[PDB]
Design a protein around this nucleic acid. Structure first.
Length: 36
DNA sequence: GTACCTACGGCTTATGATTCTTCTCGCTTCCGGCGGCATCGGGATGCCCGCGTTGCAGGCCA
């Protein structure tokens, strides 16, 4: 938190997608793990 | 020395909603009794004749 040495980060509102809809679905949470 | 909060996932149980069972209002109108009279087919009653019912004794069956 040094105003001359810190490195913050900014969030954007670029797009409005349905990721939050699949956040808690028990179906999207089961199909999303495709890390293979 | 001690108490109270939620996320990660599944089955159930504690209560407001919709299709299937049931309880029975409305009378009115076409339809079903209801009674009287002419009609017709059956049959009970009588006589005749042969067949259906029954007793005896034997051979067959459950």
């Amino acid at each position: 938190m040094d105003p001359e040495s810190r490195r913050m980060l900014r969030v954007t509102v670029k797009d409005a997608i349905a990721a939050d809809q699949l956040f808690t679905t028990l179906m999207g949470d089961a199909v999303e793990p495709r890390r293979a």
